[PDB]
Design a protein around this ligand. Structure first.
Ligand SMILES: O=C(c1cnc(N2CC[C@H](O)C2)s1)N1CCC2(CCOCC2)C1
Length: 462
């Protein structure tokens, strides 16, 4: 089959009541079942609309407020899928696996692939030199059940985010895939998307067509809003992408979507309500990739579009960019820092007076809640008119752009093209990437621009 119905669910999760000591296994199962009822409502809706696969969010079933012991009652010992097990049909094969059983049955009775995130526990002995002192590993685990309810993939999150002290890290990164009549799929979780393993190995070495992506992502503007960066990543890596995000505006958790190599196909962003949302979209089983892009070709082919600028430092996500302020309603600007030069050409729909935009270049190591080397070229709307706010989270803008064109002398080929509009809206089909590394507008933007960014990762320099 050449196309398939993809679904993602944004889940307003029921969080376990605050308790000082760990709950019983029955209370744990009761809370997880409260979440699975809602998730099943989504799965049934997707099946009734003919979906082939549905992704649900990270931590969607038991939440994220845990220490090791208070999490333990929620864990199940999840076997390796090579055991060839359908929990729905052979319950009791392995013992105390009710959550796996219910996920299996949801996948089977609704004839739909189900991707869910749950907790794995793996007992270990002192025989094991890295057994944790409390006698077991606990892993943040994606499980996939096929349309028959078979366990076809289990993935332990490699790159733990801060505040995940309830979990352990696998001894080695797990490259987990599963094959289907509608393509080869790879899986990783939330923070993983910012690192090489497994996320980049899946695409570059195992050539998967589609990533399934449970996430509990807290938006960090201007470059790391969920929809913005996930769709940008799918575009740069050239895969389909099913991002299923928690809904929790209080913590800036919102943004779910279905993304394709050529464009975003569906997306959701909602800070106002507490409702979940099911998204569906058609995808090609095996997409085309246009010619690969040399991200520094064009940028290395110009001389600076501007010289003797008034440059200044301004802070984006604790990273200090070198900025030049955009003064004219249209202009050609170049900005450099260390090894990275960023070129912008732009014509705004109008000069909104109390709105300031800037072009910034960053080339260095990020260290706050994550260590990773970055090369970023960004056109962005400054939070206020104060140049000290250029880089701060900005959610709204009024300046639309008639045209833009951004490029950079990137020292990496992993560069993810981002375009975000006011109110955190994607711009599907309004822009393109050329083979020589320009991200440019195909027409005037449909809404005011928050950012146009080329976000590049230099994994070797971590
Ligand atoms: O995977 C994640 C990420 C959430 N936001 C992330 N990023 C990436 C870029 C920027 O740093 C923002 S990663 N998890 C799982 C555990 C979690 C712990 C925090 O509280 C609740 C949920 C958060």
């Amino acid at each position: 089959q050449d196309t398939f119905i993809a679904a993602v669910y944004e889940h307003a999760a029921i969080l376990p009541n605050a308790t000082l000591t760990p709950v019983s296994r029955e209370e744990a199962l009761a809370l997880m079942n409260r979440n699975l009822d809602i998730l099943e409502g989504a799965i049934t809706s997707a099946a009734d609309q003919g979906a082939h696969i549905i992704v649900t969010p990270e931590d969607a079933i038991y939440g994220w407020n845990f220490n090791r012991d208070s999490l333990y009652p929620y864990l199940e010992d999840i076997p390796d899928p090579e055991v060839n097990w359908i929990p729905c049909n052979n319950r009791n094969r392995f013992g105390q696996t009710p959550v796996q059983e219910r996920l299996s049955c949801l996948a089977k009775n609704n004839s739909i692939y189900v991707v869910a995130n749950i907790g794995d526990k793996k007992p270990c002995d002192t025989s094991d030199p890295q057994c944790p002192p409390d006698g077991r590993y606990q892993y943040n685990t994606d499980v996939v059940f096929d349309s028959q309810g078979k366990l076809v993939a289990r993935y332990h999150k490699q790159n733990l985010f801060m505040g995940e002290n309830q979990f352990n890290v696998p001894k080695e990164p797990e490259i987990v895939t599963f094959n289907t009549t509608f393509g080869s799929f790879g899986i990783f979780t939330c923070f993983d998307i910012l690192f090489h393993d497994p996320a980049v190995t899946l695409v570059k070495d195992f050539h998967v067509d589609t990533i399934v992506f449970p996430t509990a992502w807290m938006n960090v503007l201007p470059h790391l809003s969920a929809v913005e960066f996930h769709s940008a990543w799918a575009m740069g890596m050239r895969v389909n992408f099913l991002a299923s995000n928690i809904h929790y505006p209080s913590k800036k958790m919102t943004g779910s979507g279905i993304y394709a190599p050529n464009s975003s196909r569906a997306f959701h962003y909602d800070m106002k309500t507490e409702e979940g949302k099911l998204l569906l979209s058609q995808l090609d089983s095996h997409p085309s990739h246009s010619a690969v892009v040399n991200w520094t070709s064009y940028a290395s082919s110009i001389e600076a579009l501007s010289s003797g600028n008034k440059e200044f430092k301004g802070t984006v996500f604790f990273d200090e960019f070198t900025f030049v302020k955009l003064t004219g309603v249209a202009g050609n600007y170049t900005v450099c820092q260390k090894d990275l030069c960023c070129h912008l050409s732009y014509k705004m729909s109008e000069n909104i007076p109390n709105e300031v935009y800037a072009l910034g270049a960053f080339d260095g190591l990020h260290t706050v809640e994550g260590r990773y080397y970055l090369q970023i070229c960004t056109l962005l709307k400054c939070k206020t008119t104060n140049l000290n706010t250029c880089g701060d989270s900005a959610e709204t803008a009024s300046t639309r752009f008639e045209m833009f064109s951004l490029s950079g002398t990137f020292g990496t080929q992993y560069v993810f093209p981002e375009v975000l509009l006011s109110e955190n809206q994607l711009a599907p089909g309004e822009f393109q990437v050329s083979t020589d590394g320009r991200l440019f507008s195909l027409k005037p933007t449909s809404g005011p621009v928050l950012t146009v960014t080329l976000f590049g990762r230099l994994y070797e320099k971590d």
